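Hey Z.,

So I finally got round to the adenosine-5'-diphosphate thing we talked about over coffee. Here's the setup:
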Amino acid sequence: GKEAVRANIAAVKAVEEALKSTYGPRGMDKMLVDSLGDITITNDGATILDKMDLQHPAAKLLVQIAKGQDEETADGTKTAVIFSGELVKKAEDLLYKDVHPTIIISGYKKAEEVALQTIQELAQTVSINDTDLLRKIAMTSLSSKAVAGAREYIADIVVKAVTQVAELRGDKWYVDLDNIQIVKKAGGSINDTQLVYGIVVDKEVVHPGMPKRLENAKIALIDASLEVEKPELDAEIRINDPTQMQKFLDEEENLIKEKVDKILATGANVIICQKGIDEVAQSYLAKKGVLAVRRAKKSDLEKLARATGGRVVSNIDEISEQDLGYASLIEERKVGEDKMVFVEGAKNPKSISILIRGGLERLVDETERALRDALGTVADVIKDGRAIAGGGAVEIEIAKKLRKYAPQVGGKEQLAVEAYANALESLVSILIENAGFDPIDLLMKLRSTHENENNKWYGIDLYAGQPVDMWQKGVIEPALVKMNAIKAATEAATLVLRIDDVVSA
Amino acid sequence: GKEAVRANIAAVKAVEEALKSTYGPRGMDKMLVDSLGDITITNDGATILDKMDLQHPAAKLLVQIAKGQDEETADGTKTAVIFSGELVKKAEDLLYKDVHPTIIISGYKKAEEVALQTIQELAQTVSINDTDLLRKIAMTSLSSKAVAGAREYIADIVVKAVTQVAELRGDKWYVDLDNIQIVKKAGGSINDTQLVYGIVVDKEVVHPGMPKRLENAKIALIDASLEVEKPELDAEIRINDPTQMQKFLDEEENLIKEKVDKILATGANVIICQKGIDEVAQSYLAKKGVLAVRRAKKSDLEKLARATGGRVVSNIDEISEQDLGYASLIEERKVGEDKMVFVEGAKNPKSISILIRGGLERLVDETERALRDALGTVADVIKDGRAIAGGGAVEIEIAKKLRKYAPQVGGKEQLAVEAYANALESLVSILIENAGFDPIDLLMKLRSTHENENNKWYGIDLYAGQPVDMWQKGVIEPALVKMNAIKAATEAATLVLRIDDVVSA
Ligand SMILES: Nc1ncnc2c1ncn2[C@@H]1O[C@H](COP(=O)(O)OP(=O)(O)O)[C@@H](O)[C@H]1O
Ligand SMILES: Nc1ncnc2c1ncn2[C@@H]1O[C@H](COP(=O)(O)OP(=O)(O)O)[C@@H](O)[C@H]1O
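And the result:
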């Protein structure tokens, strides 16, 4: 009964109160200071919840549904939760009127149904051919984050980056984000960032006496120990004369050269690994004319593996005339400050990376967040093929269309549905609020400007304060992201109500 | 006297107050947070009592009778207890009137008798031939749990799954649930779950160089250590020259190959065990063309043992030309995300398994609960052969029929019986309550609609709020489950009253 159910609700409303002021494209920012001392300020939902530990079960339950939503991009999780808590709020008012929660559930379900198809039988068909459209959908996502200086630059990139990896595995597209690497290093402004048509390794070469530019390379992904073997563990021993010394360090030096020749046995122009490479073994590779790289996060070896059609050598005594990937040109431009290795024109085409350079140690970090989400979302538009105008446009519609529905739904459930609708408009008010305008004023002024059947795409320009056509202003979103959000929010919302009591161990 | 007897009752009523709000098919849900931090919300009685530690003796005594009821399925234990506590409540009112508890006992006994046969001489004869009926009885059980999306899918499965294992050992059916394995792994929705006509092992093959598909296999259930023998415990020793090394690791490697050949001595296409298999022994089995699996819960070896007509090899030096089971086709489809081994078309027909895939790490878990109970109950319908319409239909009947009985029973005992009846209707009110309708209103409106001798199967549709024919709406239950419940509840109920005082050590 009311006992605990109030608590869960409480907790949920609580989570809402944590993002509410950051919703919308011109929302606020929350600050986060690591215990280490480092500060990071943002308005990315995932981060605001990952870095913010909540304890109450209901809450972990809400976020579990929100973050681990139904798809790629992190977008809409912020909606999923806000809208989620709003249903809870507006549902609370129903319990006050004494309507069994089981009813508010059915009410919401039926409302969800309609609310949902109302997006389908309204969404517009977007095809990856139309490149001038995604140019917008991209900004409609990244323009939302801190970094809003010359976004067209980043926006444009994001579009090319995805269309590059896309495929048509049986008239059914499949964009695998893993085919894109993202590396970042301080320096200049964000305009100094660019996309490379191949993998990019952030780690300077091992020795200066090595080829800093190979034509038609044959990469050798060697993952294993490549340094003189400490021989102390194997043996503890004494020594007399210098005659013994020589033959000791000589063959021991020849032991590493063995692994090296056994690898060059495939004849590779370049060889990179993820462990410490001996300094004596460098002079050897240097004299051989090989290009080698020290420790390097396995995280990129893989992305570089299937990007150059090679294998990540497990055991050196097993290397094959094929485990080595091919390329076209390797380089090491000292871009920014440090020097990085490039592997442009790989064997595998659909495989590129992006290089972020925000400038400051932290500004760069959040550019990566925005970019991650930006890419994800764009890929989702393609994987599906439906896209609607964002701006609260779909909210008010889902509302109105819902109000005309309620009347017939039934006795009490009606109230549930009428509610589901009101809670939903609350969504757009919050959006207005953060814009700095009277939420009620514009909401009424907008839901009014939706009488004209030819305004479906009308929303509220958060800079001029007035209803305008969102679509014809470059503001679109994956009709699926803001759709799964609704399924999500309602899932959570009705789930909290389904709960009668909590007993833990 | 009143002294302690109040306490026990108190405790019992207490247990009722813990499930009451979860009774019925549209009941509430209770939340459970493990001390580890993980949360599980449910309305399955067993779980609500297992995960909820009660201390008072009476309570452990009630649940002992309830859980360890009289049969398979966990269903009705929730009834057994609620109804149990209701008799206690309504019996308490009798003590208030000063009627020795010994009398309330006899009262209840005699009422139980009648209440019981009233189900027999009223139940309808169901035969396993009628497959279109169990299609319902299954839903009448699983539709009750959280997972209510496309249940017809699961419901249908459950029916085929049992009829598959059923037997007629001397015109007396015997369904052994153990002949059905249940494996679960996240991924997609629940619609992505299916039943396999043979055992299914959740564990990827041991080596990539092995046959991932054998025609007509001869399984070898080898339960024992299959890895190079650590020789340190056996011996501690020194070493000089490399001549000694070779003959050491060589024969030691040949030691494991021995066990392998001694097993292949039966000539098996596949061999799986429940321990760690050496990596060198893999290269051997790989070169031999055998399909082997690493550690695997003994829990499935057995289900796979008598499912393929083989023995679980205790000692490798004892394997026989028969201890190995036969099959038809083994496979390893990467269904979902990970890869699992299948053993379809085994030697033994009546032996299948079910694969659950709810999607989320927890959603999948409760689908297994619902499914377990769902299977159990269906099997019980067959083992017996009698089934009645659920929906409170039988309650009100057992009531009415009971009221006409009371008058003749006797002086005081009458009140006991009239009570036994009232307490029983309370059962259906609780059911109504959770539906969101006035318990009294409908109960009277329903027990009224039972004047018409042709409505016996009439109950209250918990979605429209009105008496309708439950039977003709696909709502049936094992006339035995809701029968043993009554025996159970009354057992417990009268047992608490039989107690005069508790003295512990
Ligand atoms: N340019 C824009 N003009 C008006 N509304 C916008 C614009 N961009 C996004 N929105 C609205 O903001 C809503 C929420 O997005 P946002 O606040 O960025 O975080 P999230 O996508 O995680 O909810 C979406 O409903 C959306 O249509
Ligand atoms: N579809 C239905 N319509 C009406 N009553 C139902 C339906 N399904 C089950 N019931 C009633 O619910 C009662 C209790 O079942 P339930 O609440 O699921 O848990 P348990 O079986 O453990 O008591 C049974 O008496 C039963 O007939």
